[PDB]
């Protein structure tokens, strides 16, 4: 339709923003513990999928918790300590989150450049309708 | 009459595009007020009903925020650009149609 380009770019921007927000939240909760109701904090990731309308935009179905084992730290003085006196610290890969943020920023800038070019082309298109 | 009927659809499309532009401007200007819900209108249904005030409905939130605001900047910007381009196209179509109707008188 020559106008689904805007939809594709907007979906890409929204997905990149979601992924960046997830990475930022993980970085903020890198060294947290004992969230609500006492359950240990676990990191989360996002999964990108394409919308087969062929070629289509990107979407994020749901946020998936990481299955990597939590860090078990010996500290009996914490009420969260089990019979072995261990507390469950969250699994956060700082380098992984930095790389994810870098990738999200680069994809966002590429998509905004594509939007700029297509907007210029579409503005120039209407000059022939007179 | 006939002259008004030949242009009613394009004129109403232009008017609805202007109203949707105003809605988008308002809900992009209120981007920081907590408790404010995003607003927009169903363009196709509105145009069909008017060709046969203005009905508006809330937008589905994208990500939660503690304050309560539910406006997404990139989505609003894309919608703004799309509506602006479609308004420009409608104006061009109306102008060409009027130019042809004027030209037929010579």
């Amino acid at each position: 339709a020559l106008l689904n380009i805007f939809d594709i770019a907007g979906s890409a921007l929204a997905a990149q923003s979601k992924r960046l927000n997830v990475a930022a939240s993980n970085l903020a909760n890198a060294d947290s513990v004992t969230g609500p109701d006492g359950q240990p904090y676990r990191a989360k990731q996002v999964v990108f999928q394409v919308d087969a309308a062929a070629t289509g935009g990107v979407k994020v179905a749901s946020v998936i918790e990481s299955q990597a084992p939590e860090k078990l730290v010996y500290e009996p003085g914490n009420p969260l300590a089990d019979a072995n006196g261990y507390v469950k610290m969250p699994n956060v890969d700082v380098v992984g989150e930095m790389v994810n943020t870098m990738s999200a920023s680069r994809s966002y800038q590429a998509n905004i450049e594509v939007l700029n070019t297509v907007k210029s082309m579409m503005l120039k298109t209407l000059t022939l309708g007179q | 009459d006939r002259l008004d009927a030949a242009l009613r659809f394009q004129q109403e499309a232009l008017n609805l595009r202007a109203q949707r532009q105003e809605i988008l401007a308002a809900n992009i200007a209120n981007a920081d007020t907590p408790g404010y819900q995003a607003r927009d209108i169903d363009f196709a249904s509105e145009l069909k009903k008017v060709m046969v005030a203005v009905d508006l409905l809330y937008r589905v939130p994208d990500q939660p925020s503690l304050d309560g605001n539910t406006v997404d900047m990139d989505r609003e910007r894309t919608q703004f650009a799309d509506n602006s381009l479609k308004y420009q196209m409608g104006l061009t179509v109306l102008g060409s149609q009027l130019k042809g109707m004027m030209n037929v008188l010579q």
């Binding site: - | 589905v60 994208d62 939660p64």
Partner: peptide, 21 residues
């Protein structure tokens, strides 16, 4: 349903409980 679509009703208000009630 899908984010960014049109809905006739507002979403419930957001809250961030520090501790569960």
């Amino acid at each position: 349903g899908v984010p960014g679509a049109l809905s006739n009703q507002p979403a419930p208000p957001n809250e961030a409980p520090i501790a569960t009630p």
